[PDB]
Amino acid sequence: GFLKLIEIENFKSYKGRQIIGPFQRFTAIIGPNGSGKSNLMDAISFVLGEKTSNLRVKTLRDLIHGAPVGKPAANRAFVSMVYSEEGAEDRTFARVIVGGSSEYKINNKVVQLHEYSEELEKLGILIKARNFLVFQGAVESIAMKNPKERTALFEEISRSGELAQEYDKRKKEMVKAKKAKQAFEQIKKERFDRFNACFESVATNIDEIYKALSRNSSAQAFLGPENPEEPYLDGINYNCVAPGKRFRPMDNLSGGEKTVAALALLFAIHSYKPAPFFVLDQIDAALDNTNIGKVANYIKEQSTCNFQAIVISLKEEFYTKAESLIGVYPEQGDCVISKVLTFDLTKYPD
């Protein structure tokens, strides 16, 4: 499972027809301050089916290069992705802007969005959950979550939170024919099971993730509900044995160890419904020299087996661990123009 190559024509700052990549197991997108790096992330969201309203433009045609300043470069634009799967031939997923409509194609076969997303979902790519993407600030956001805020996060990702209405509604019918109880225990078990189908997987994985991020067997990490019988009703506790430290809660961890533990939680949650590739947008922003190389090598190790890593990074200590660099640079022009270079880092020692 491998995003091999992205092709772009006239999409936001990527003027003209450009080839992005090929991508390697661990590829870093880098470059000086400019619009191009974040436009490439939007290109990936776009080709995986993201709604216009989630791409910070008001109209689909606003994604065509130059259309913001009333000079679109064409009536068409596109992003395509070549996707490779072991044992299968390559498939190209393309989304073309044709006037005001999208046109979706799998190997130049025109399909509706429903079928396009169905085929991506069979690959583990979930546009509704954005499982393939870690946005800026996601580490700092997860580090700030309290036990009850984690529970709501688990209620959402597990689709148990959509049973919260029928839950206390059947409890209402039960508080007042000793059979509405069994109707309530019925919906109680369904919410519990959907919750634990997700949560027990996440809780199982987090220890090994925390160990690999810490590069230390002495580290360990524990997830568990305050309310084991009905986890969704109360908070989720998160305790770590940080290397060379006592067994402590997360919300009491040292500033640097805390981000590593938030990272372990972040990754453990994505381990639940993982994508075959992971676009990490400045996931190293909250890192410092305590933990930058450890996390970079974790990504490096994970990239060989568990997921293709595509990282957008401003920090050399992080991105010099990638196999490939895609450098983004600006061209002078009417509007911002982005172009890319590719650089093979594996040719150099260290």
Partner: protein, 63 residues
């Protein structure tokens, strides 16, 4: 033609960090218009030629 510097030649005997730093300098110098860039195919050599905001020696610029 004009003076031209090969990034892959510049990176002989460098480690990953130094090689990445030279690659990044091409992006910065192109942004500053001190050079122009050409790459023929993905992962082929990257060639820097003069840009309009630098008139010195490219060889000296990348020493």
């Amino acid at each position: 033609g004009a003076e031209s510097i090969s990034l892959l030649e510049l990176c002989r005997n460098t480690n990953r960090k130094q090689a990445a730093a030279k690659f990044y300098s091409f992006l910065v110098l192109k942004k500053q218009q001190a050079i122009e860039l050409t790459q023929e195919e993905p992962y082929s050599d990257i060639i820097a030629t003069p840009g309009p905001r630098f008139h010195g020696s490219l060889e000296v610029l990348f020493q």
